[PDB]
Amino acid sequence: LDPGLQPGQFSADEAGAQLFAQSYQSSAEQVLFQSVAASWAHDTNITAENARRQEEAALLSQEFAEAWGQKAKELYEPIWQQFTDPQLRRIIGAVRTLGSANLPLAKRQQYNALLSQMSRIYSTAKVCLPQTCWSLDPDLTNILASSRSYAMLLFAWEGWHNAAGIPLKPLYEDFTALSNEAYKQDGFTDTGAYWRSWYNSPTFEDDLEHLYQQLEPLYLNLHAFVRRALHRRYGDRYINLRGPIPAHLLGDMWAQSWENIYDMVVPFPDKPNLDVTSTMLQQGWQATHMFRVAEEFFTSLELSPMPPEFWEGSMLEKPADGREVVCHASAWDFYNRKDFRIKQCTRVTMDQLSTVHHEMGHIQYYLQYKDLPVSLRRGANPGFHEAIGDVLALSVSTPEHLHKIGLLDRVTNDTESDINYLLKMALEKIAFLPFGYLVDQWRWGVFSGRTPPSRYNFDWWYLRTKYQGICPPVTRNETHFDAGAKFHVPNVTPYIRYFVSFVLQFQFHEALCKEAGYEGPLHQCDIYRSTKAGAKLRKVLRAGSSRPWQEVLKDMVGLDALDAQPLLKYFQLVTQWLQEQNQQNGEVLGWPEYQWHPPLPDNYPEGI
Ligand SMILES: *[C@@H]1O[C@H](CO[C@@H]2O[C@@H](C)[C@@H](O)[C@@H](O)[C@@H]2O)[C@@H](O[C@@H]2O[C@H](CO)[C@@H](O)[C@H](O)[C@H]2NC(C)=O)[C@H](O)[C@H]1NC(C)=O
Ligand SMILES: *[C@@H]1O[C@H](CO)[C@@H](O[C@@H]2O[C@H](CO)[C@@H](O)[C@H](O)[C@H]2NC(C)=O)[C@H](O)[C@H]1NC(C)=O
Ligand SMILES: [Ca+2]
Ligand SMILES: [Cl-]
Ligand SMILES: [Mg+2]
Ligand SMILES: [Zn+2]
């Protein structure tokens, strides 16, 4: 490591730790910036040379973290928890956690290789036919979303899970062992305990379960309503009105979001859909204007505009020069207090306008906490960033807001269109809740050893049926590794944050709507042009992770805890309607025939 980047001499007391932390920040910004810039250069210009430069930068960052982490532990391990400065305790406490840097040199290289291999297996997995082959993006995704042929959906679902999961299993086993070995040296019983420690809650798992108990009735009613609709479409041979739903029929490879089957379940189909896409096109909107419109939403709250560096450096539309890029939208903090960017192959549609606002919500977060020490430039807990992005989108998606920005002449007030709106939202927000909760329950069991490799798939499908009420549409056994067929598993990205953020965002919404002086149905609230809501946002965002998330949340919503009631209050109208619908049809809530699996279609897979 360059001598100017490794730590010098510092004294083993709090005053010395302040100097240590300031010197850490100076070098850390350089290291962090070069890593983000190298990822940016690759993700906006995918070449092998750029991929190589990115790996160089990542390994420099790892080397930096180990050098400063070992120094921090040598000097402050027995004393940092008694420092009087709480932000210093947060900084030092993070620096002394080495993760994979605790592994012997060859194991550390193996750990990094496993991460790269697992990521590559997932991104190149494909489903071949009895011939060309399909890729997850966009081939299989579009089949799951729009095909209504049971056997076709089945072929894509089975093909993908076998292709992505099976080769991952031997690697995931080795990753699990090395990951645990590394974090045991940081003082954690296993990797899952380290992930959970980010929430700094002695009763995190109990708190989560109590939350889900309050949410489960809404999911069960949505599940039974949708299961009825599927029964009408595919018949009694493939749909058990008292059993789990076959996992490939909900519009999504993982059945985590059901909005792609909205057309089957529309409460009131005779009402016009809400889609202002064509009006955007007639008004001449393009990607840049969409971002300027999003920017004006933030300035209307007296939040910060996008700085010139954002407009100069961002990739707001797919480059015309034929460059290969990552088109999925993402927001970038370069950790130099200067460069902040969005990378998105923006298209001119209503849904994309909502995404622009969401992603700019991430940028606004970055800009508000950019004067904090680098270690504290993150959300108050790992679920805050998505919750901030999503709460802004909750306002911007309403017909009320679309009217105000010139995209919808007349706002209807018939209750039937309200139900349609809420049911569409529920297919996205409520259907996801069991999946967001269960993924890390599976990984926590794997990390702790309660789920050895011999029961990876058994415990995966236990959780999937228990919470989502689905079953695999073909028989599975322990040669299959269906957890591996979800991006975040081989790419080792924690997941409970997303369940947390789905709860949080409705807590945020209620608080901000009240601060905005809004009165009426929560799902019609738009905080646009409320400087009082903007002030309340500003105080959460500028805090970064400098303070306990429970206290930041208390200042914002008046409660120091996650709470499911604001979500239930948002959806109360459609929850009521679903209950009535299910009781009119005499539905069984749940899946009492838990052993049920559907049969294979005749002569599978010689089909169209
Ligand atoms: C585990 O399953 C594999 C895969 O077989 C498929 O999945 C099963 C659950 C079942 O639905 C089968 O009908 C499917 O074909 C089994 O490996 C297959 O074994 C058969 C013998 O019946 C053999 O002819 C195939 O060549 C095998 N297929 C592959 C891809 O290897 C395996 O036997 C099952 N049991 C165990 C313990 O692994
Ligand atoms: C995309 O990345 C490639 C690198 O892989 C860039 O090509 C390099 O361009 C510089 C000049 O900027 C040359 O000095 C190098 O010799 C080039 N490398 C190769 C392998 O040809 C390319 O310019 C980038 N494209 C854009 C639009 O930024
Ligand atoms: Ca997503
Ligand atoms: Cl998390
Ligand atoms: Mg959406
Ligand atoms: Zn986001």
Pocket test for ligand 2, best of 39, 40, 44, 45 (most atoms within 8 A of CB): 45
Which run of H or E residues covers position 342?
Answer: strand 340-343
Cα 351 to ligand 5 centroid, rounded to whole Å: 6
Ligand 2 near 45 CB (within 6 A): yes
Residue 134 has what DSSP assignment?
Answer: E
Ligand 1 near 477 CB (within 6 A): yes
d(CA 151, CA 482): 19
From the list 468, 5, 571, 561, the residue with the least C-alpha distance to 223 is 468
Ligand 1 near 213 CB (within 6 A): no
d(CA 434, CA 466): 9
Decide: 99 and 70 in contact? Cβ < 8 Å.
no
3-state secondary structure of 343: strand
Per the DSSP assignment, residues forming a β-bridge with 340 are: 333
Residue 283 CB coordination number (10 Å): 12
In order, the DSSP letters of 280-321 are HHHTT--HHHHHHHHHHHHHHTT-PPPPHHHHHH-B-S--TT
Active site annotation includes 181 = no
Cα 93 to ligand 3 centroid, rounded to whole Å: 31
Deposited resolution, Å:
1.9
Ramachandran quadrant class, 221 (left: phi over 0; alpha: psi -120 to 50; beta: rest): alpha
Active site annotation includes 42 = no
Experimental method, per PDB record: X-ray
From the list 589, 108, 109, 212, the residue with the least C-alpha distance to 438 is 212
Decide: 317 and 345 in contact? Cβ < 8 Å.
yes
Ligand 2 atom closest to 48 (CA): 5
d(CA 538, CA 409): 32
Cα 112 to ligand 6 centroid, rounded to whole Å: 26
From the list 243, 230, 259, 266, the residue with the least C-alpha distance to 468 is 243
d(CA 252, CA 225): 18
List the structure tokens of 289: 């204007």
The active-site residue out of 259, 295, 359, 515 is 359
Pairing of strands 470-471, 245-246: parallel
